[model samples]
Structure formats: C-alpha cells, structure tokens
Target chain A: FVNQHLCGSHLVEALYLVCGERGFFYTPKT
Target chain B: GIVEQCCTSICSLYQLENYCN
Candidate 1:
C-alpha cells in the first residue's frame, strides 16, 4: 500500500516512500 | 503491504541501512 503526501511540497510524485511500525522516515531522490 | 516492511523487516533483516539493497 502506497501512502502519498498531503501538503504537496515534497519530491517528485509525492515521494514514493515506505513506513512500517514507526520506522525511520524519509523521502528518497530529494 | 508486507514488502513495504523492507524498511525494517527487510532493511534490518538484510542490513540495508539506506533501505535500498
């Protein structure tokens, strides 16, 4: 399941990120 | 939904610090 950003001020294409049980969060290719 | 676990499950499981193996 992909989760997109809400503010719309991130990397391209809402930054295809990944999260799991409060894992270290970040955006790729920024 | 599980593949996403690569962040921790796989990242740590496989030791991918950057979460990209």
Candidate 2:
C-alpha cells in the first residue's frame, strides 16, 4: 500500500534489538 | 511492555522523519 517493502525492512533489525527477536510489528496497512 | 512500545514509537518517528525516502 505504501511502497513499504524495502522501506519497512529497516524495522526488522530494530525489532530484534529491542525485543531480542524479530517479527513484523508495524505496517502501512492498519 | 511500555518500554518496548515507547521505543517502537520512537523508532517509527525517526523512520518517518525522512518519509522513508
């Protein structure tokens, strides 16, 4: 929806840093 | 939980700061 495929991958790394694991947390879609 | 949420919000804030350009 937001052309977020590459843009949003930045989130994956931080998810592991903060949560000690990786997963999808946010999206352009509500 | 709140800690992670806060950090996540901050993360999103900075991410969108550049509008993901």
Candidate 3:
C-alpha cells in the first residue's frame, strides 16, 4: 500500500501548497 | 494485396515539475 499511501500523501502536499497550511486547516473535507 | 492502416506515434515527454508548484 506504499503507492496508495504516497499518493494520498502527495495529494495532501499539493493541497497544502495550493492552499496554505492555514487555508487547508480551515477548509472542510468532503 | 494488404491495405495499409494509418498509425500515429506521439513522442511526448511529461515532466511533473510544476504540478506541485
């Protein structure tokens, strides 16, 4: 599950990049 | 006689450099 885990992690990383750390914290998860 | 079929080859390179930027 390393690939899957890495994919999720990278997705979060991308989100953090697009929306700053605070923005991500404030956004609601769907 | 064998009819020739059309064939296309795309030699494209993708660099995921800005995807994270």
Q: Which candidate leads in lDDT?
A: 2
In angstroms, how far off is A26's CA in candidate 3?
Answer: 10
Tell me how each candidate scores on DockQ against the true complex: 0.06, 0.07, 0.03
RMSD vs true structure, all candidates: 10.9, 11.3, 16.0
Docking class of 2: incorrect
Residue B6's lDDT in candidate 3: 8
Chain A TM-score for each of the predictions:
0.14, 0.35, 0.44
lDDT of 1: 0.31
Could you tell me which residue pairs clash in candidate 2? none
What is the full ranking by lDDT, best candidate first? 2, 1, 3
**lDDT (tens digit, per residue) of candidate 2 on B1-21:** 222343445434444333222
Which residue pairs of candidate 3 clash? none
lDDT tens readout by residue for model 3, A1-30? 011121334544544554553444322234
**Candidate 1 off by > 4 Å:** A1-22, B1-13, B16-21
Ranking by TM-score: 3, 2, 1
For residues B1-21, write the lDDT of model 3, one tens digit per residue: 000110121111111112223
i-RMS values of the candidates, in order? 10.9, 11.8, 17.4
Question: In each prediction, how many residue pairs overlap at the backbone (N, C-alpha, C within less than 3 A)?
Answer: 0, 0, 0
DockQ-derived CAPRI band for the predicted complex in model 3:
incorrect
